[model samples]
Target: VNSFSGYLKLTDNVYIKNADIVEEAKKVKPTVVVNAANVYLKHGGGVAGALNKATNNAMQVESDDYIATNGPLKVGGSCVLSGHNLAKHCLHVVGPNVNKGEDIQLLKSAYENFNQHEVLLAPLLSAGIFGADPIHSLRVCVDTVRTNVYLAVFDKNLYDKLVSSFL
Candidate 1:
């Protein structure tokens, strides 16, 4: 149970913490587990991949079914899938790929689309393979999150950077 060690309050309801998001999601069991997803919802790497592994690929199957029914998600768009063994649901958000010149507004839009649930377990969207700057992603999360949010970070350096800025 020695996981999700510490946190700093970014606002009244939002906090940043060092966490293995998949593990924390299991423990906290938030209303929705936010997935930093691609437009295709592939669940290949980062938080999406880890959650897919935890659910024995059920999440990916749902993603495939969702796309088959709804078409590919546009940037900043989102859809929900059954969480299987994790939370009640998985909220898949297609973040702006900064490498392609998308900016903070789209990333903010992704956060804005979070389910209106009491609690949420989320990562810094677009901060990983999508190539958005970590700090910028963190700022967007803090600025837009309205529910009780645990902003999980797996990287020590990024955690420290957020701590310095907020704590």
Candidate 2:
């Protein structure tokens, strides 16, 4: 699920760098997905490294595993930066849609960073780094950064579907 490009993920370069989370988030719905400026549809279809041993046992091109690559999702985040998505809802999904390899540490850190970036408004000043402080910060609590996120009011049903998904 980490093979998806930033084409439809976010519009700004924020948080972490894990292919699994990237792939999984791509398959979900977010109102305002922030990513980098250079991201485009042309970055699609680049095979990532080895698949997750756990996910490989379940993920497939089925309905559940399908990445909603061809649709207009209504997206709107609390922040006014602006981003992109494939649905027509206000689901805010952000993170690094990069090619995650087998480096378990990298993947885990990336995921934490990804989740933390999609907030009210965060500048890309200094987020990419490897250390114990940030990691310890995220693991200490759940939803500590929830206030900065918003799923949008475009799709109520999609809200539950998406919120439950990212967790």
Clashes of each: 0, 28
Give TM-scores for every candidate, taking all chains together and pairing residue i with residue i: 0.90, 0.24
Among the numbered candidates, top TM-score falls to 1
Q: lDDT (0-100) at residue 16 of candidate 2?
A: 30
- Candidate 2 versus the native: TM-score? 0.24
Who wins the lDDT comparison?
1
- State the lDDT of candidate 2 residue by residue for 27-119, as single tens digits: 644443432111121211212111112223222222122234533211211211222232122122222333322232332333333354444
- Score candidate 2 by lDDT: 0.27
What Cα-based lDDT does every candidate model obtain? 0.82, 0.27
Candidate 2 ranges with C-alpha deviation above 4 Å? 1-19, 32-79, 86-130, 133-135, 140-143, 146-167
lDDT of 1 by residue, 5-117 (tens): 46677788777878888988888776788888988989888888988999999888888888899889989988878878888888888889888888658988888886466
